[PDB]
Amino acid sequence: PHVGNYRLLRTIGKGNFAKVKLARHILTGREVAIKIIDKTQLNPSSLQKLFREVRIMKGLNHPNIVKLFEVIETEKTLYLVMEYASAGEVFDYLVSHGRMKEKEARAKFRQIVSAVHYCHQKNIVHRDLKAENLLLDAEANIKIADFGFSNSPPYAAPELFQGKKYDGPEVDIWSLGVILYTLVSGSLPFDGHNLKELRERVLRGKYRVPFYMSTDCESILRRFLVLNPAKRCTLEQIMKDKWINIGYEGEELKPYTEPEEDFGDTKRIEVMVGMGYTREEIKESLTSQKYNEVTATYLLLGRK
Ligand SMILES: CCc1sc(C(=O)N[C@@H]2[C@H](N)CCCC2(F)F)cc1-c1cnn2cc(C(F)(F)F)cnc12
């Protein structure tokens, strides 16, 4: 019930290799989520994917992507201390509260587009965008989680169902069209019992659209759910769309740029010394994006 500066609370996730636990940072009192991985139970390729995952995580800084704080290493187990998305899956939110009204789907979807574009810019392709990997904080903001399979069938592009060419950003774009479709309707655009039916409908690319849907919504989905990855619209282009910006007259959705982070908050620096941190230790490990006990404590003292 303790690893590093963390008290392990309850398991909040379980995969076929990893488990996520809610934890409390004993110094700052902040809640975090730790993705626990037993490296001994992993085959050589998933071990390679876990190392890719940790690298990708290190190179991302967006307010709508679950952020890494600390990496606790042991011979047999890897500990990935990240943000805790308090309100859970969007999937659950939809079953619990019904389809989202377009103002709500727009608020959430703009964030997803900002976050997914940022990844493509920093040469990352999520490859697992599902409503499961989409979560919320207490202020109901999207936080894209996982990155295990980066560089599900109902969200998978037609080319991947065939076993065709790679490319990348385009496969995440088809998924975003599947996400928006669920956000506004509650259901998935393409389904069907056994895998053969789902494969057929994704490939035919035919989806019903509900009477309540706005004409601008039905249009914006056609830009994403393009059966041809080449003719599929780009995120820089879709960000300019009528729908994405309804009720955002001044602020049209433009690509995210990571701002200048202040690694010199005099108030958080002194408050750390009163715990056991030294001037030389803080300065040396803050200036450098190390992700250690020090870095984590400083980022957590401005979170609450
Ligand atoms: C450490 C931060 C991570 S890594 C990550 C993750 O990789 N999950 C995968 C997989 N998609 C599901 C099975 C376990 C798995 F294999 F690990 C998810 C989270 C996370 C952050 N806040 N939070 C809140 C909840 C919830 F809903 F509130 F319970 C659930 N998960 C989280």
mmCIF file of N, CA and C and ligand atoms in Angstrom, residues 12-15 18-20 33-35 66 80 82-89 132-133 135 145-146, ligand 1:
data_model
loop_
_atom_site.group_PDB
_atom_site.id
_atom_site.type_symbol
_atom_site.label_atom_id
_atom_site.label_comp_id
_atom_site.label_asym_id
_atom_site.label_seq_id
_atom_site.Cartn_x
_atom_site.Cartn_y
_atom_site.Cartn_z
ATOM 1 N N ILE A 12 -8.349 0.997 -10.038
ATOM 2 C CA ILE A 12 -9.331 1.747 -10.814
ATOM 3 C C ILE A 12 -9.274 1.311 -12.302
ATOM 4 N N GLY A 13 -8.521 0.244 -12.564
ATOM 5 C CA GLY A 13 -8.340 -0.286 -13.906
ATOM 6 C C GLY A 13 -7.577 -1.584 -13.969
ATOM 7 N N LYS A 14 -7.929 -2.435 -14.909
ATOM 8 C CA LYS A 14 -7.215 -3.696 -15.103
ATOM 9 C C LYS A 14 -7.209 -4.109 -16.583
ATOM 10 N N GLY A 15 -6.013 -4.182 -17.161
ATOM 11 C CA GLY A 15 -5.795 -4.622 -18.528
ATOM 12 C C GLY A 15 -5.175 -6.004 -18.530
ATOM 13 N N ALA A 18 -1.219 -4.609 -17.594
ATOM 14 C CA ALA A 18 -1.146 -3.526 -16.620
ATOM 15 C C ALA A 18 -2.407 -3.401 -15.764
ATOM 16 N N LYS A 19 -2.293 -2.647 -14.656
ATOM 17 C CA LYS A 19 -3.378 -2.281 -13.759
ATOM 18 C C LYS A 19 -3.181 -0.827 -13.324
ATOM 19 N N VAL A 20 -4.266 -0.067 -13.208
ATOM 20 C CA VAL A 20 -4.179 1.326 -12.764
ATOM 21 C C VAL A 20 -4.757 1.410 -11.351
ATOM 22 N N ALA A 33 -3.098 8.897 -10.363
ATOM 23 C CA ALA A 33 -3.382 7.546 -10.817
ATOM 24 C C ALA A 33 -2.035 6.983 -11.209
ATOM 25 N N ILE A 34 -1.732 5.767 -10.748
ATOM 26 C CA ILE A 34 -0.477 5.094 -11.086
ATOM 27 C C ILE A 34 -0.772 3.851 -11.939
ATOM 28 N N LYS A 35 -0.168 3.777 -13.144
ATOM 29 C CA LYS A 35 -0.263 2.617 -14.036
ATOM 30 C C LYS A 35 0.907 1.712 -13.669
ATOM 31 N N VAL A 66 -3.812 12.969 -20.392
ATOM 32 C CA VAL A 66 -3.387 12.564 -19.048
ATOM 33 C C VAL A 66 -1.861 12.749 -19.002
ATOM 34 N N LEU A 80 4.060 4.236 -13.405
ATOM 35 C CA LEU A 80 3.784 5.436 -14.181
ATOM 36 C C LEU A 80 2.774 6.313 -13.482
ATOM 37 N N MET A 82 0.671 9.445 -13.058
ATOM 38 C CA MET A 82 0.038 10.396 -13.984
ATOM 39 C C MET A 82 -1.149 11.067 -13.304
ATOM 40 N N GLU A 83 -1.855 11.973 -14.046
ATOM 41 C CA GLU A 83 -3.067 12.659 -13.566
ATOM 42 C C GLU A 83 -4.169 11.646 -13.362
ATOM 43 N N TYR A 84 -5.049 11.938 -12.399
ATOM 44 C CA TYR A 84 -6.233 11.113 -12.152
ATOM 45 C C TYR A 84 -7.448 11.844 -12.711
ATOM 46 N N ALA A 85 -8.067 11.298 -13.795
ATOM 47 C CA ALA A 85 -9.292 11.832 -14.407
ATOM 48 C C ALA A 85 -10.469 11.351 -13.542
ATOM 49 N N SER A 86 -10.781 12.182 -12.562
ATOM 50 C CA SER A 86 -11.759 12.007 -11.498
ATOM 51 C C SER A 86 -13.168 11.480 -11.925
ATOM 52 N N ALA A 87 -13.767 12.064 -12.985
ATOM 53 C CA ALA A 87 -15.116 11.777 -13.497
ATOM 54 C C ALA A 87 -15.257 10.531 -14.408
ATOM 55 N N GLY A 88 -14.167 9.828 -14.669
ATOM 56 C CA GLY A 88 -14.194 8.584 -15.440
ATOM 57 C C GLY A 88 -14.356 8.669 -16.950
ATOM 58 N N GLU A 89 -14.713 7.542 -17.582
ATOM 59 C CA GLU A 89 -14.923 7.410 -19.029
ATOM 60 C C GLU A 89 -16.093 8.207 -19.564
ATOM 61 N N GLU A 132 -13.620 4.798 -24.237
ATOM 62 C CA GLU A 132 -12.988 4.232 -23.039
ATOM 63 C C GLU A 132 -11.746 5.052 -22.659
ATOM 64 N N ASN A 133 -10.920 5.439 -23.662
ATOM 65 C CA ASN A 133 -9.675 6.203 -23.489
ATOM 66 C C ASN A 133 -9.895 7.700 -23.338
ATOM 67 N N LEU A 135 -11.567 10.512 -21.081
ATOM 68 C CA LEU A 135 -12.036 10.741 -19.745
ATOM 69 C C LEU A 135 -12.180 12.194 -19.377
ATOM 70 N N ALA A 145 -6.212 9.276 -22.360
ATOM 71 C CA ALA A 145 -5.436 8.294 -21.637
ATOM 72 C C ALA A 145 -4.977 7.156 -22.540
ATOM 73 N N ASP A 146 -4.049 6.351 -22.001
ATOM 74 C CA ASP A 146 -3.388 5.161 -22.528
ATOM 75 C C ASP A 146 -2.037 5.470 -23.198
HETATM 76 C C1 LIG B 1 -2.117 6.213 -14.633
HETATM 77 C C2 LIG B 1 -3.101 7.037 -15.430
HETATM 78 C C3 LIG B 1 -3.938 6.237 -16.383
HETATM 79 S S1 LIG B 1 -3.148 5.174 -17.506
HETATM 80 C C4 LIG B 1 -4.649 4.588 -18.148
HETATM 81 C C5 LIG B 1 -4.511 3.306 -18.869
HETATM 82 O O1 LIG B 1 -3.469 3.072 -19.483
HETATM 83 N N1 LIG B 1 -5.550 2.450 -18.872
HETATM 84 C C6 LIG B 1 -5.508 1.146 -19.533
HETATM 85 C C7 LIG B 1 -6.850 0.754 -20.185
HETATM 86 N N2 LIG B 1 -7.416 1.817 -21.029
HETATM 87 C C8 LIG B 1 -7.862 0.302 -19.131
HETATM 88 C C9 LIG B 1 -7.335 -0.863 -18.296
HETATM 89 C C10 LIG B 1 -6.047 -0.496 -17.561
HETATM 90 C C11 LIG B 1 -5.019 0.038 -18.516
HETATM 91 F F1 LIG B 1 -4.439 -0.995 -19.183
HETATM 92 F F2 LIG B 1 -3.963 0.529 -17.818
HETATM 93 C C12 LIG B 1 -5.709 5.197 -17.519
HETATM 94 C C13 LIG B 1 -5.306 6.144 -16.514
HETATM 95 C C14 LIG B 1 -6.291 6.930 -15.703
HETATM 96 C C15 LIG B 1 -6.158 8.237 -15.203
HETATM 97 N N3 LIG B 1 -7.235 8.659 -14.452
HETATM 98 N N4 LIG B 1 -8.080 7.552 -14.497
HETATM 99 C C16 LIG B 1 -9.309 7.439 -13.945
HETATM 100 C C17 LIG B 1 -10.013 6.239 -14.195
HETATM 101 C C18 LIG B 1 -11.448 6.089 -13.783
HETATM 102 F F3 LIG B 1 -12.262 5.879 -14.840
HETATM 103 F F4 LIG B 1 -11.933 7.170 -13.124
HETATM 104 F F5 LIG B 1 -11.637 5.020 -12.985
HETATM 105 C C19 LIG B 1 -9.395 5.241 -14.923
HETATM 106 N N5 LIG B 1 -8.174 5.353 -15.456
HETATM 107 C C20 LIG B 1 -7.536 6.512 -15.246
#
